[PDB]
Design a protein around this ligand. Structure first.
Ligand SMILES: C/C=C\C=C\[C@@H]1O[C@](O)([C@H](CC)C(=O)NC/C=C/C=C(\C)[C@@H](OC)[C@@H](C)[C@@H]2O[C@H](/C=C/C=C/C=C(\C)C(=O)c3c(O)cc[nH]c3=O)[C@H](O)[C@@H]2O)[C@H](O)[C@H](O)C1(C)C
Ligand SMILES: Nc1nc2c(ncn2[C@@H]2O[C@H](COP(=O)(O)OP(=O)(O)O)[C@@H](O)[C@H]2O)c(=O)[nH]1
Ligand SMILES: [Zn+2]
Lengths: 83, 385, 208, 99, 60
RNA sequence: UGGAGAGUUUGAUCCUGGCUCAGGGUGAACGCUGGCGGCGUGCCUAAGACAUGCAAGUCGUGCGGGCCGCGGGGUUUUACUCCGUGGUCAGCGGCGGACGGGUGAGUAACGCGUGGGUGACCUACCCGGAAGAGGGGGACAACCCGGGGAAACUCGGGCUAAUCCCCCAUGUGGACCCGCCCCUUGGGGUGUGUCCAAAGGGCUUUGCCCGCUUCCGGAUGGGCCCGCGUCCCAUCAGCUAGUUGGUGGGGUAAUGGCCCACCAAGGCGACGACGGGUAGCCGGUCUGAGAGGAUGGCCGGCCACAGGGGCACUGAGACACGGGCCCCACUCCUACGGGAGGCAGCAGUUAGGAAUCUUCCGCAAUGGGCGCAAGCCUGACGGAGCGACGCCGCUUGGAGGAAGAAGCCCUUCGGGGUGUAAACUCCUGAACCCGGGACGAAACCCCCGACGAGGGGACUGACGGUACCGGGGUAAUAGCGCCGGCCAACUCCGUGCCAGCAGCCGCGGUAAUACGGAGGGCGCGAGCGUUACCCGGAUUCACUGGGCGUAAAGGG
RNA sequence: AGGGGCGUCGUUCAAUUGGUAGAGCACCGGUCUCCAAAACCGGGUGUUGGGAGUUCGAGUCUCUCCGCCCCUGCCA
């Protein structure tokens, strides 16, 4: 099904992912359906992570199983937090 | 699907000499099919192994016969001892004589004579006339002939019993017991030399195979030091420039070995190396150690007539064939001022210009042949080029 | 790697006495001072009228040998100078100056350029705190260049920091003779850099 | 030397056999029904045809007639029959067909 | 064509050809690289060696 | 924000015009030489053939067993081995093996690109909504036993469990026929008739979690169709019978001659049909002032293929790379009657070739399949290894130091040059030695809160004792091209149309900046040259931007 | 690794009568010429593939090497 995982960008020993709503079957770094954010595992930059609000929630309201390590970031960006 | 190989008993290389049509090539296929009963897992020279209950063996059975000198002369060095085979029917023939002389030219200490073809023409003197003329020629050639473990038996028969049924323990055939006599009186008398695992690795290359799926393998008895998988090495001698690769396999008689050391005829699989890139004569040494050279000098000792050598002497501009290791190269000769007419019996120090770059090295020894006869010996001095 | 060899040899060949030695090549014998004529078995004869090519080659080797840079490095900078908005002549020189081993020299610390390199290359130099060992590093506007701690004691940093008594720096670089700092206030200029080199003549070397 | 994909083949054959049979049926019934629709057997025509129409949607339940590949087989049946009865017959027993 | 002065190529030597003609020899349209296969370098050649094969001689 | 020309036809000139060169580029190869690191990148040929190992599995929270360790002996012992039990071997059943990975052979085509159409359709798992999950029957494995066989396996007899199979029911609904209304290609509503559902599994148990069934909708992914665009030869000019259309059938998820009857004679073509050659297409890449030209390797998208060829089965999906059948070729085993097998998966071998890598480390990360979960599998992937193949960074020392050693080479016998170069003197300290030493990793999960939001806790690092950091610390690599002109750089000897050079013009016939060596210089530097190929220069196919009286060029 | 062949001036070809090595061109000097061609004078220019072996001496008869053609060899 349609998922919400991470696509690896940035060269060797410089991981930089892209939070995207790809299709389960795609390749990790193949054509994604829509980028909604990125993530920097080394934090090198006061913006090591950023995610699109209204979007993430949208794809969730239409069945988009987020990876575990993916969901971690959606949360850390306060996506589910219903207040 | 390979079968590992563990060491327990001390290794030792041997071979069989004699006259073409006598025994040797047959007692080898006798000694092997014998020590395979009480031991688990057991034109061109065939290196066949056989293990006893006191030591591990190699055994280089040279086809013998003339023409096959260059191929025989090689393995001669690789062996710590030689089983001089003689037939009862005939006796000391040209080959039995030729092989023994060449057996001396090429180092090889101690001799263990075996009287085969005993099962032929029973004669009081015959069986005791042969054991005579043997020591007559062996000693005429400076060998311990008067104290050489001479055994007696028929190999042709000794084997036909083992082909009926594998297992055939001690003296259960009497004939396959005389094979246990020489095979026993062999791990005795002939000792074990000094195998220094301290010197920078180096093994001459005899044959070169191309084991499918793995690559090119270079057989040969290690001359010093050791080598295991992962060690870098160099192919010195012959070819444009000394190649450099890595060993990725070391095996002892078709069975995966672990670490080979001086004294074992172990084959080595060389990392990505075409089979044209490796040939006879070359040496596998530790990187940096030894190099390829053409010209050199040597404390060469020119033999004399009374010892097979020449008897007329050569001049400056003579082209003989030198045997450094498992190979043979040719070269021009231009010695120091004067010192011309180097007839038989001299220790002259001339210079050679081999046409093929061979792994030279001050200290290393060689020999000289020309016209099918050992014209002389020697040892490199100052490496000119 | 950055040439390394008879240098006053260039002092000569280019005919515009260079400063590749800092002290001697600044004294009464920059070699030029005794042979204002190019090296070689000849170096002093009827110099045929220089070809339109020769002229531009020389006007380029000059400007590049001044900084010791390699051709690869040099040409890359020039290309970079082009694409960047603004006169390529100025800009080129600008960037060419922003070089570190240079700003090391353009601030004392080192007697020469060839020296200012072995300096930065050996740590002794420092940017906004953290140090750098790369000459090619291009200093920006607002970055002071300090020396190192284990350096302020060495025999060399002494004399070099000594001559700094009184002597002044270009209007684009300040300097604390004791605090051994100095801020890269602004990128220099064709003018500020009174170099014996016609850039537009070099700009033209990288054309045909 | 081998894999547990074999499991997948064994089944393969079984299931093959399963709906391979359900199909033969529907085919046989469909034909038998129409084969009467012109004879005039209006009564037992709609009788068999009503049965055929059963195994159709029936097989459709699984992976036999997968989907509305059944819906088609049906209309072609209760259209081939109906258009055979009005060839002098009148719909007797109220079978599948509806007037 | 066989460059340099003096070669060791006989009726069965194996060489390695490359592009390059020779304006005087009407048929010759290729050159024989030197220092590759049966073709040795040029003896003594101290000048342009990269071409002509011949390896850097140690002044010795 | 962007445009350079030169050599060469003549005794000389101008023009025409070809040839050639300076620039950039490359999955490169060859020569000489070669120190470090980072990020890249590496069979362009035989889509030749391949040893070996690994590349796809997983679920006992679907089901019955074999078997082993064990609560404790079931009866009282070792009887019914019941049950407790975490494991384990298959079997049955399910989901995934259709993705991920490889290759470019084929294909000039709706294959691809682009924009659209589908009232002509499909979509597992994922979301949202609606209604359900009531009865019953049955089989085949496993296992037991008998049998054939060299093997691979196979046959018979008989037990048995399910989320396996089947019958009846409920019909929210849906399917279908005919009717009607709306709407307009087969879509939406409605009425009569007919036909169709389903499975239980685990707990912490009248409730949750995981499933099941039918329907409507969302997502995503697709099939089919269409307009325009897509190489060379016209010395290839005519092509076509399922051919072109029709009617009625078969077929499919669905349109269609897709296939078939029958009827009609059509359909296509210089706007290049047909045929031959070549070729995967694109984003892009190189070059170019631009317009263009060339190209399509790594990365991403699409297509095609899986030893050659044909075909179906299973299934949401394949006519299926590590599934099946068959023919053929080749490999292998055979007890000769029949067996096993496909690296264009990751490493590796061999052949061919000018030439293209380790039979590595790890699932720690990211991503995937299965699972309630723990977790399992993952040669995808994250890394390490080899090769200057490419780019970027760094080193081989910095400062001193003679009207200037030696040697070497010139020399108008004074001298000149290599040369501040060295020697030599202070000097910083590549390497290396010692200690310290990561980020990449925070969630699945545990707990409070309801397993929601939010808060807290723990395990986990292949690359690595590597990067990086402190301290200690030796002066410690240089080559290659070229020096007639174009084109930066000149002198001596040897040689004597010889030997040789050579991109073009052309150099060598005894004084040769053009051969060979030497000294000297120029260019660039861990590289520098060579060969091959593309663009440029070439307004030399000219749209931008040319020409035809006599230079090629007006048709009689 | 082991069989068998060929190899002669610079070249194409002889001495299978074992007695220093023979012919045509090619070419080399002498004259003419700036240098050649032509013309006239006059020339054997030789690693008998190498190096050793017998012989009073070897192209020839023995070996052993070199390069090449050929036929079989060759999985630690
Ligand atoms: C000889 C071939 C290859 C040699 C290779 C190398 O040799 C060696 O360099 C070796 C090192 C010493 C070497 O140089 N060998 C090189 C040489 C070494 C020679 C050494 C020792 C001698 O002393 C003078 C030694 C044999 C000596 O001779 C005597 C022999 C007398 C013979 C009379 C002949 C008689 C009746 C006869 O009928 C006869 C015959 O049969 C054949 C031919 N013609 C004849 O007329 C006696 O027996 C003594 O013992 C090493 O061994 C290397 O490692 C090697 C094996 C690679
Ligand atoms: N009469 C007899 N013949 C034997 C004996 N040993 C071997 N042979 C035979 O002699 C022939 C040659 O034997 P082989 O060993 O090949 O001789 P080698 O190769 O010269 O040692 C073969 O037929 C052997 O079987 C024996 O003891 N007596
Ligand atoms: Zn100076």
């Amino acid at each position: 099904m349609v998922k919400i995982r991470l696509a690896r960008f940035g060269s060797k020993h410089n991981p930089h992912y892209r939070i995207v709503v790809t299709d389960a079957r795609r390749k990790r770094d193949g054509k994604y359906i829509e980028k909604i954010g990125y993530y920097d595992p080394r934090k090198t930059t006061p913006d090591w992570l950023k995610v699109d609000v209204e979007r993430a929630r949208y794809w969730l309201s239409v069945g988009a199983q987020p990876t575990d390590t993916a969901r971690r970031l959606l949360r850390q960006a306060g996506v589910f937090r219903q207040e | 699907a390979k079968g590992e190989f563990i060491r327990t008993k001390p290794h030792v290389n041997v071979g069989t000499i004699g006259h073409v049509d006598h025994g040797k090539t047959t007692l080898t296929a006798a000694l092997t099919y014998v020590a395979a009963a009480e031991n688990p897992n057991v034109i061109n020279t065939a290196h066949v192994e056989y293990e006893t209950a006191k030591r591990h063996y190699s055994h280089v059975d040279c086809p013998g016969h003339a023409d096959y000198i260059k191929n025989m002369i090689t393995g001669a060095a690789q062996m710590d001892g030689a089983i001089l085979v003689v037939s009862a029917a005939d006796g000391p023939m040209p080959q039995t004589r030729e092989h023994i002389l060449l057996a001396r030219q090429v180092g090889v200490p101690y001799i263990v004579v075996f009287m085969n073809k005993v099962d032929m023409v029973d004669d009081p003197e015959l069986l005791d006339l042969v054991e005579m003329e043997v020591r007559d020629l062996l000693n005429q050639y400076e060998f311990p002939g008067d104290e050489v473990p001479v055994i007696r038996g028929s190999a042709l028969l000794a084997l036909e019993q083992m082909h009926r049924n594998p297992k055939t323990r001690r003296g259960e055939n009497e004939w396959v017991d005389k094979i246990w006599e020489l095979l026993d009186a062999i791990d005795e008398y002939i000792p074990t030399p000094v195998r220094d695992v301290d010197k920078p690795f180096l093994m001459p290359v005899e044959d070169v195979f191309t084991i499918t799926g793995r690559g090119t393998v270079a057989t040969g008895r290690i001359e010093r030091g050791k080598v295991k998988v992962g060690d870098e090495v160099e192919i010195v001698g012959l070819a444009p420039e000394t190649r450099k690769t890595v060993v990725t396999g070391v095996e002892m008689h078709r069975k995966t070995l672990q670490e080979g050391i001086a004294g074992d005829n172990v084959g080595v699989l060389l990392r990505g190396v075409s089979r044209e890139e490796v040939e006879r004569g070359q040496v596998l040494a530790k990187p940096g150690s030894i190099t390829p050279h053409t010209k050199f000098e040597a404390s060469v000792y020119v033999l004399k007539k009374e010892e097979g050598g020449r008897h007329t002497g050569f001049f400056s501009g003579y082209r003989p064939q030198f045997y450094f290791r498992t190979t043979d190269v040719t070269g021009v000769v231009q010695l120091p001022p004067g010192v011309e007419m180097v007839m038989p019996g001299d220790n002259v120090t001339f210079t050679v210009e081999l046409i093929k770059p061979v792994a030279l090295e001050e200290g290393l020894r060689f020999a000289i042949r020309e016209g099918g006869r050992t014209v002389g010996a020697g040892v490199v001095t100052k490496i000119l080029e | 790697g950055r040439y390394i060899g008879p240098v006053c040899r260039l002092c000569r060949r280019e005919g515009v006495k260079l400063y590749l030695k800092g002290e001697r090549c600044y004294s009464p014998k920059c070699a030029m001072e005794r042979r204002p004529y190019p090296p070689g078995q000849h170096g002093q004869k009827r110099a045929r009228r220089p070809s339109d090519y020769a002229v531009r080659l020389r006007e380029k080797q000059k400007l590049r040998r001044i900084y010791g840079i390699s051709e690869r490095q040099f040409r890359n900078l020039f290309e970079e100078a082009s694409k960047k908005k603004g006169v390529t002549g100025s800009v080129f020189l600008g960037l060419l100056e922003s070089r570190l081993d240079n700003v090391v020299y353009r601030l004392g610390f080192a007697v020469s350029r060839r020296q200012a390199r072995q300096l930065v290359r050996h740590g002794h130099i420092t940017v906004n705190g953290r140090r750098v060992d790369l000459p090619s590093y291009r200093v920006r506007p607002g970055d002071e260049i300090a020396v190192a701690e284990k350096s302020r004691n060495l025999e060399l940093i002494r004399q070099n920091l000594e001559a700094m008594k009184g002597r002044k720096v270009g209007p684009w670089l300040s300097l604390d003779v004791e605090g051994m700092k100095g801020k890269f206030l602004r990128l220099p200029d064709r003018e500020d850099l009174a170099l014996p080199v016609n850039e537009q003549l070099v700009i033209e070397f990288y054309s045909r | 030397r081998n894999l547990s994909a074999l499991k997948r083949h064994r089944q393969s054959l079984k299931r093959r056999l399963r709906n391979k049979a359900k199909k033969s049926a529907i085919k046989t019934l469909s034909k038998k029904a129409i084969q009467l629709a012109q004879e005039g057997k209006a009564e037992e025509a709609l009788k068999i045809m009503r049965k055929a129409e059963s195994l159709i949607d029936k097989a459709a339940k699984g992976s036999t007639l997968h989907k509305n590949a059944a819906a088609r087989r049906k209309s072609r049946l209760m259209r081939k029959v109906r258009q055979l009865l009005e060839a002098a017959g009148a719909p007797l027993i109220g079978g599948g067909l509806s007037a | 064509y066989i460059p340099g002065e003096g070669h060791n190529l006989q009726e069965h030597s194996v060489v390695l050809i490359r592009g390059g003609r020779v304006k005087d020899l009407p048929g010759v349209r290729y050159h024989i690289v030197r220092g590759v296969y049966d073709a040795a370098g040029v003896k003594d050649r101290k000048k342009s060696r990269s071409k002509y094969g011949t390896k850097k001689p140690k002044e010795a």
